[PDB]
Amino acid sequence: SGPLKPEEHEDILNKLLDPELAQSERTEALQQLRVNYGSFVSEYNDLTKRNNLLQAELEELRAVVEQTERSRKLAEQELIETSERVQLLHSQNTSLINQKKKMD
Amino acid sequence: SGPLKPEEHEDILNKLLDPELAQSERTEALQQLRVNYGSFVSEYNDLTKRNNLLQAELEELRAVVEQTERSRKLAEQELIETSERVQLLHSQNTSLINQKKKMD
């Protein structure tokens, strides 16, 4: 499955403490460490690759923020300009009812 | 420093292959594996914690996007409403020059 839990890694080390351990049980135990350290490095590289992957997501996602704020600041700036256009037209519309009610 | 490179981990395993290895050199070698597997699990947990940390950054950063798009869609919707206000005032301003040029 996955790399050994540290207390399981200790179970192997404990077995190798015996100096009169059979070679077959010693070399089998050393292979368990060999294999497990491989799948540990493997699962660490698969995590360290998922890591600098998320680093590319938000680094691109924050660019989306800057683009959305660009669009938003434009819409507000266009709203301010068209707002000032309403003011003028309403004040021309004001200075022109000064001619319809002026007659008679 | 950090966990052992796999070829350095192999250097320890190779030493333990000797059945007539001194106990002092055997138990020293097993401690190297003991310690190194600790600092490996340590550096893996410090990476797996940096991992689900970035998971909280962009998960909160995408909420900023949704808030900025909320603000942007409001500004565009307000721009459309005030734009339609300009149209009317300009068309009232049109139907009122039909009274200033109408006189004489």
Kindly list the domain boundaries of chain B, sorted by start residue: 6-100
Cα–Cα distance between A93 and A84 in angstroms, integer? 14
Cα–Cα distance between A81 and A59 in angstroms, integer? 33
Entry resolution (Å): 3.1
Cα–Cα distance between A12 and A49 in angstroms, integer? 29
Q: Are the beta carbons of B58 and A61 separated by less than 8 Å?
A: yes
Cα–Cα distance between A23 and B3 in angstroms, integer? 28
Cα–Cα separations (whole angstroms), residue B75 to A1, A73, A82: 53, 9, 12
Q: Cβ of A9: how many Cβ atoms within 10 Å?
A: 22
Closest partner residue to B75 (CB to CB) among A41, A79, A100 is A79
B64, A63 in Cβ contact below 8 A?
no
Q: Which CATH number fits domain A6-100: 1.20.5.400, 1.10.357.10, 3.30.70.260, 3.40.120.10?
A: 1.20.5.400
Cα–Cα separations (whole angstroms), residue B57 to A50, B30, B62, B88, B92: 15, 41, 9, 47, 52
Min Cα separation B1/chain A (Å): 17
B85, A84 in Cβ contact below 8 A?
no
CA atoms within 13 A on the CB side of A65: 14
* Identity at B43, one-letter amino acid code: E
A29, B19 in Cβ contact below 8 A?
no
Q: For residue A101, what is the DSSP state?
A: T
Min Cα separation A67/chain B (Å): 10
Cα–Cα distance between A40 and B37 in angstroms, integer? 10
